[PDB]
Structure formats: structure tokens, C-alpha cells
Amino acid sequence: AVTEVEIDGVLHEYSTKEGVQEDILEILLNLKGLAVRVQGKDEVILTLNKSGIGPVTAAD
Amino acid sequence: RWYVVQAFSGFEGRVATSLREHIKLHNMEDLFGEVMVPTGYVLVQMVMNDASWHLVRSVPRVMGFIGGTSDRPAPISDKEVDAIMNRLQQKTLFEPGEMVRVNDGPFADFNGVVEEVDYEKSRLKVSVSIFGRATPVELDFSQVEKA
Amino acid sequence: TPEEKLLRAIFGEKASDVKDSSLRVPNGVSGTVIDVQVFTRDGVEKDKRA
């Protein structure tokens, strides 16, 4: 499951993003329920590079 | 309504009864309901009028009324709200004998006339009115405003 | 005295050797900051944040 996350544009929670409906506290919980499988390493750092008009899937 | 009668410590209480002493001499009804002796400050219940003011001017001279103006107590807005209204009105042109309104330091909420205009030192020796008298103090072109 | 001309650089700040406090976080209470708001009197200057 999800533990530590660094936002590009936000440092502390309790704020509202420019051009998003869902608040950070909402999104924190969206991340909690996300499912991950790991085989190869122990701990990894990954990135969510996304832009445009469209709904955020999960794969990208 | 409540008007603050300023009196002198030691005989400050004496003024509070000297109210009630002279009240009976000039007498009719009303005006004075409940004379409070709280203590330089004597709080006195009164609705505004010409009567009782003439009495105070007949027996002084230590202190008078408190608030905003001595004739008619007692407002609450002094000179900072006046310093906000001066911004719409607007000069750095200061000379001997022009009114030079202060709004910085312990000389804030107070006005004054500039005594000395220094261009080399960039100061205005603005005479602020305190204690029925004057206080000449150097305050910057910004620490003051032209009236 | 001399001692004040000899105190203006241990505390290399202000005109004199004087500094105390105002108010603090209470002991036991612990939380996170969100948004701070400033209300300084018109007449005297403000800080960087204001």
C-alpha cells in the first residue's frame, strides 16, 4: 500500500489545486485503496506524469 | 450615554462630589442619573446639553472632559481613519507654517504644524499637540502628511 | 556605560541588549498549520509575509 508521496506544486495538505475537483484529503484516501503488486525489488520511487483534458485512469 | 470627566488625582474624587454639590445649586431634574467614582478619570452618566458644561467652566482648572472633543464627549475614532481619507485627497511640498499631519511613532493618532523644514537631513520637525500644549519632534516626510 | 558599547555585538541587533517573548504553542496541544492571516495597523509597516 501507499506510504510517502511528494507533490509537485503542493508541500502541505489542506489546500486546493488549480484546475482539479478533488481535494488532497479526498485524494489521500483514493491512494490508500489503490492496489500494488511487487516482485523484483523491496522499495521503489515512481512518477505520475499526466497532462490535458481527461479523467485520470491508473495505468499511465 | 457615558461621558468621562477627567479630574486631578488626590482631588479626583472631590470633583465627583463637586459634581453632585453644584448639581443641587443649578438644579431642576434629570441629566445626572448615576455618578460613578471608578478611580485621573471620573466616568459620569449624562446626555449631551449646554447645562453642566457651564458649571465645569465656572469651577476649574485641573482637567475637563474626555473622548474626542472637550465640548461634546465622547466619540471613539481619532486620526488613523483621517489618515486613510488623506490618501484619496493626495504632497512632499513642506514649508514653514503649513499643517503637517503625523501618523507614525508615538505621535500617531495626532496632528501638528511643521516647525523646521530640513531638505539636507530629510526631516520635518512637526509640533504635535499634547496636554493642552505643544511637542516639537522630527518626523520623516512619510512619517507625516500634508493637510 | 562602556558595557553597552560592549553589549551591541553579542546581541548584534537592536539598539540595546533587550529581547524577551510574546506567546507560544501550549504544552500538550500538537497540530498542523494550513493558512495564516495578518492584520497590522495602518500607520506602521508590515512584514514580508503580510
Curated annotation (Swiss-Prot), chain A:
S-S bonds: none
Domain comment in the entry: The N-terminal domain is essential for RNAP assembly and basal transcription, whereas the C-terminal domain is involved in interaction with transcriptional regulators and with upstream promoter elements.
Function summary: DNA-dependent RNA polymerase catalyzes the transcription of DNA into RNA using the four ribonucleoside triphosphates as substrates.
Quaternary assembly: Homodimer. The RNAP catalytic core consists of 2 alpha, 1 beta, 1 beta' and 1 omega subunit. When a sigma factor is associated with the core the holoenzyme is formed, which can initiate transcription.
Family: Belongs to the RNA polymerase alpha chain family.
Name of the protein this chain belongs to: DNA-directed RNA polymerase subunit alpha
Species this chain originates from: Escherichia coli O157:H7
UniProtKB/Swiss-Prot annotation, chain B:
CDD domains, sorted: KOW_NusG (cd06091), NGN_Bact_1 (cd09891)
SUPFAM superfamilies: N-utilization substance G protein NusG, N-terminal domain (SSF82679), Translation proteins SH3-like domain (SSF50104)
Span of domain KOW: 96-127
Keywords: Transcription, Transcription antitermination, Transcription regulation, Transcription termination
Domain of life: Bacteria
Entry keyword Lipid biosynthesis: no
Any one Pfam family match given in the protein's UniProt record, by short name: KOW
Any Gene Ontology biological process: transcription antitermination
GO cellular component assignments: cytosol
Role: Participates in transcription elongation, termination and antitermination. In the absence of Rho, increases the rate of transcription elongation by the RNA polymerase (RNAP), probably by partially suppressing pausing. In the presence of Rho, modulates most Rho-dependent termination events by interacting with the RNAP to render the complex more susceptible to the termination activity of Rho. May be required to overcome a kinetic limitation of Rho to function at certain terminators. Also involved in ribosomal RNA transcriptional antitermination.
Record note on quaternary structure: Monomer. Interacts with the transcription termination factor Rho and with RNA polymerase.
Protein family membership: Belongs to the NusG family.
PANTHER family xref list: RHO-INTERACTING TRANSCRIPTION TERMINATION FACTOR NUSG, TRANSCRIPTION TERMINATION_ANTITERMINATION PROTEIN NUSG
Cited HAMAP family: NusG (MF_00948)
Protein known as: Transcription termination/antitermination protein NusG
Organism: Escherichia coli O157:H7
Biological classification of the source: Bacteria, Pseudomonadati, Pseudomonadota, Gammaproteobacteria, Enterobacterales
Gene: nusG
Curated annotation (Swiss-Prot), chain C:
Disulfide bonds: none
Coiled-coil residue windows: none
Subunit structure: The RNAP catalytic core consists of 2 alpha, 1 beta, 1 beta' and 1 omega subunit. When a sigma factor is associated with the core the holoenzyme is formed, which can initiate transcription.
Family to which this protein belongs: Belongs to the RNA polymerase beta chain family.
Its job: DNA-dependent RNA polymerase catalyzes the transcription of DNA into RNA using the four ribonucleoside triphosphates as substrates.
Protein name: DNA-directed RNA polymerase subunit beta
Native source species: Escherichia coli O45:K1 (strain S88 / ExPEC)
Residues of the full protein shown: 896 to 945 of 1342
